[PDB]
Write a protein that binds this ligand. Structure first.
Ligand SMILES: [Cl-]
Ligand SMILES: [Mg+2]
Ligand SMILES: [Mg+2]
Ligand SMILES: [Mg+2]
Ligand SMILES: [Mg+2]
Ligand code: NA
Ligand code: NA
Ligand code: NA
Ligand code: NA
Ligand SMILES: [Sr+2]
Ligand SMILES: [Sr+2]
Ligand SMILES: [Sr+2]
Ligand SMILES: [Sr+2]
Ligand SMILES: [Sr+2]
Ligand SMILES: [Sr+2]
Ligand SMILES: [Sr+2]
Ligand SMILES: [Sr+2]
Ligand SMILES: [Sr+2]
Ligand SMILES: [Sr+2]
Ligand SMILES: [Sr+2]
Ligand SMILES: [Sr+2]
Ligand SMILES: [Sr+2]
Ligand SMILES: [Sr+2]
Ligand SMILES: [Sr+2]
Ligand SMILES: [Sr+2]
Ligand SMILES: [Sr+2]
Ligand SMILES: [Sr+2]
Ligand SMILES: [Sr+2]
Ligand SMILES: [Sr+2]
Ligand SMILES: [Sr+2]
Ligand SMILES: [Sr+2]
Ligand SMILES: [Sr+2]
Ligand SMILES: [Sr+2]
Lengths: 81, 46, 56, 82, 143
RNA sequence: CACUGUCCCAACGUUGGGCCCGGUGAACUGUACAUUCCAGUGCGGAGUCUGGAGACACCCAGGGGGAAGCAAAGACCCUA
RNA sequence: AGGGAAACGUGAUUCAACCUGGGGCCCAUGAAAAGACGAGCAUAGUGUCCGUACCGAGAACCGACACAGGUGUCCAUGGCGGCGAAAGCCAAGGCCUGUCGGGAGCAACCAACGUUAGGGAAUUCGGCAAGUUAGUCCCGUACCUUCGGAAGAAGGGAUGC
RNA sequence: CGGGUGAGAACCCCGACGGCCUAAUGGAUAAGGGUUCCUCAGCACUGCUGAUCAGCUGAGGGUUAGCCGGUCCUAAGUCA
RNA sequence: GUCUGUUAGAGUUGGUGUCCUACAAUACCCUCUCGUGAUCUAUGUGUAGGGGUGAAAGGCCCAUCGAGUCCGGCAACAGC
RNA sequence: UAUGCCAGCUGGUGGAUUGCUCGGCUCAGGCGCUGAUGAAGGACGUGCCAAGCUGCGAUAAGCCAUGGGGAGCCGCACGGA
């Protein structure tokens, strides 16, 4: 059975979405839907997902841009990992 | 043109496949990517 | 209009593509038939004795 | 320091559509000669440039007065329109 | 130093054709160090980066010509390049004229000057191209 | 009929080449030898054989007389 | 709301788009289906999956090439000009990459051109090549003819400011 | 013509002057290409000369949709 | 199935021009013909080798056509 | 003596030659079916760094058991950690 989240996507652009928009980015399995990515995240880091945006990258894997609720602080979550 | 999810995975692979032979492999083997390709000079499948 | 160079410029149609069954770029996407393994035409795999010398 | 009148009559020997460039050569070669320095040492102030190209490339004044100065440790001239 | 990248960014921030952005010849070093659009705007503020003005063709000369012609000049045989029917569309001209005649006749009827049958008689004559213009029509009407 | 550099008969001029210089940098072709010319001879169409004549070497530019020039195992003709 | 350094207009004409009519033509008759309307209003929740870069061409496509070839669509209403989506010139925008340069009044010769007195097709298989004429308005227009045409016949005159 | 960067500058960049393109040499896109896109660092290779430049080399990065397409419908026609 | 027209677009009479180890294995320039129709055009789709398709030139069916291309028969046979 | 001819010498270019063989070629003996319990084949993944090959399959150059084996090991591949 495949897992949804593969690893955080840390790049200058990812850092901004985190600082300025409370969004975290991950490399996910390309069979995962936005909904499956949202649930996966809330359970892995215990946070609330407001919105998810996905893109099928030219690297072969799927990238997801998860925006957290104003109740959580992206930077903080990203920091522990 | 428009690419399907699968066509994208393939092109994606062909891109990664198009790399230098790790510097260290040349040491380990005491001294070429024969499949190195160029977008203009070569032609991929499909 | 010449049949050579002038007529090559009109070629941007996609026919043969990677074949889901054998992997060769022989699946004619308009005919939906692999000219290599015959996928989409034959359940059996496309073979022919002339693909080799008669005594081999 | 001196004011010299440079004739550009010899620019007529070069094809007409590009007399401007040739003129600029003639100027450099004239100063470099009359001030006893290397052509590479001659600096033409952009004001001279515009004078020669004033009516486009196919033309050029037949003469041009330029004020030149000689000096330094490498020996070179600096010039300008007037 | 190579300022191509900045030129592109400045053309988007100053929002003008790339060919209109001016970079101060004595500030390439600073412009060279500009990395982000913010760096560029900052430099725009300082004035190290500016946009030249676009040009607009003068219509002054055209205007003078436009007057001479409105006054009926500069349209002699030597100035005409198009066939007569092209300089004035005949069917169009007719639509112009006949409508002016029919309107005229319409006002003259509701005005009581013309009886219904007098109007009718003239209207059909008009429709038959009996009058060269509104004035010609009136002349006729005055018996 | 009109008109004209088509011609009598050629001239001058313009632009790009050509020529010299830096840089880049092929191909065709090559049995060998080779400075030829006039005659002759020879499978009767010779730079190479014979007899004379001429000929100090090398280089630049040229228009192409010859190498029965180079290019394609003549497509005409006959034969199978 | 936004945008603008600022002002942050008002009227008009001609009017692409878009809308809505009228007429004519056919030995030619100008798709189908899903769907929508018909069939209200509140509030809430849901709206997954795939494509999305860039080039689109005298260097990103096909032509073995960074090939003067070939290659679909729309921008067809920018200004002068004029009949014009013509020429020519100029904006907005793009470019100096139809990417080796430097010298010689720069010869012969070649390509592509300009001008040539007198003669005027004598040149040549042949007026081949070049040239002549030319836009617009007025006057005027033969044979022949299937009465449509021939016809812009030809010929003559005018043309700016 | 000045200047910038650089070990090195005719052709990489800034300014001025001078030009070229107007159904295109401008704007947006289909097919097709497939990362050619952006950044940094480079010049052995590629580039009709050179190169500090680049569609080249090395390393990173970049494509986010309920309402733009696909997806749905049926066309000539295709297959099971 | 009108006329003029480098509107778009389609074509190609002549120069027997330029090119002819080309920019190009059919290109460049000027002139020229068509330009509301038996018109031109994009994509999709159909017809397949003694068979298609052809307003008919033995034209065209991917630089290949008086019988496509690939591989096989095959190391065809030849008195040349 | 320039341009140059013939032969040699020193150094190139080139890779013949000699020597070597991880590959072939042929013969002989043995053995011989796989697949809906989804094969063969292919695609795409999979390594600390990983492009090719090999292996493997989200448990991904591997996991478990029994026996063997043995002080070494982490494939081709002699690097660094
Ligand atoms: Cl109406
Ligand atoms: Mg998406
Ligand atoms: Mg009428
Ligand atoms: Mg080019
Ligand atoms: Mg004669
Ligand atoms: Na390609
Ligand atoms: Na106009
Ligand atoms: Na250059
Ligand atoms: Na066996
Ligand atoms: Sr990447
Ligand atoms: Sr190509
Ligand atoms: Sr034809
Ligand atoms: Sr096509
Ligand atoms: Sr079938
Ligand atoms: Sr079979
Ligand atoms: Sr010669
Ligand atoms: Sr109207
Ligand atoms: Sr885009
Ligand atoms: Sr083109
Ligand atoms: Sr402009
Ligand atoms: Sr170059
Ligand atoms: Sr004169
Ligand atoms: Sr004659
Ligand atoms: Sr004669
Ligand atoms: Sr006349
Ligand atoms: Sr170097
Ligand atoms: Sr670029
Ligand atoms: Sr017509
Ligand atoms: Sr001919
Ligand atoms: Sr000519
Ligand atoms: Sr030819
Ligand atoms: Sr016509
Ligand atoms: Sr055979």
């Amino acid at each position: 059975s495949w897992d949804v989240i593969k690893h955080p996507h840390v790049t200058e652009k990812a850092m901004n979405d985190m600082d300025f928009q409370n969004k975290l980015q991950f490399a996910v399995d390309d069979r995962a839907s936005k909904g499956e990515v949202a649930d996966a995240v809330e359970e892995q880091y215990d946070v609330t997902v407001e919105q998810v945006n996905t893109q099928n990258t030219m690297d072969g894997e799927k990238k997801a841009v998860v925006r957290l609720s104003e109740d959580d602080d992206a930077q903080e979550v990203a920091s522990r990992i | 043109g428009k690419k399907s999810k699968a066509t994208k995975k393939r092109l994606a692979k062909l891109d990664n496949q198009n790399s230098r032979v790790p510097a260290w492999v040349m040491l380990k083997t005491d001294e070429r990517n024969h499949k190195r390709r160029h977008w203009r000079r070569n032609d991929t499948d499909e | 209009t010449g049949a050579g160079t002038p007529s090559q410029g009109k070629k941007n149609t996609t026919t043969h593509t990677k074949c889901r069954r054998c992997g060769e770029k022989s699946y004619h996407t308009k005919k939906k038939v692999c000219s290599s393994c015959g996928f989409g035409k034959s359940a059996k795999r496309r073979d022919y004795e002339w693909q080799s010398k008669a005594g081999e | 320091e001196r004011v010299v009148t440079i004739p550009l009559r010899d620019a007529r020997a070069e094809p007409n559509h590009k007399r401007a460039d040739k003129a600029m050569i003639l100027i450099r070669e004239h100063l470099a000669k009359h001030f006893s320095v290397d052509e590479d040492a001659v600096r033409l102030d952009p004001s001279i440039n515009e004078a020669a190209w004033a009516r486009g490339r196919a033309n050029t004044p037949s003469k041009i007065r330029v004020r030149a100065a000689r000096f330094e440790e490498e020996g070179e001239a600096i010039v300008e329109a007037e | 130093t190579d300022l191509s990248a900045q030129k592109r960014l400045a053309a988007d921030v100053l929002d003008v054709g790339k060919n209109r952005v001016w970079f101060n010849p004595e500030r390439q070093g600073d412009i060279a160090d500009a990395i982000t659009r913010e760096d560029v705007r900052e430099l725009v503020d300082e004035g190290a980066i500016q946009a030249k003005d676009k040009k607009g063709n003068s219509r002054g000369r055209a205007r003078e010509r436009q007057k001479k012609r409105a006054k009926g000049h500069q349209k002699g045989a030597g100035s005409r390049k198009g066939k007569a029917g092209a300089r004035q569309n005949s069917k169009e001209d007719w639509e112009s004229r006949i409508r002016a005649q029919r309107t005229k006749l319409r006002e003259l009827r509701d005005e009581g000057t013309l009886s219904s049958s007098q109007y009718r008689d003239l209207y059909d004559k008009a429709g038959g191209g009996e009058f060269d213009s509104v004035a010609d029509l009136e002349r006729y009407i005055d018996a």
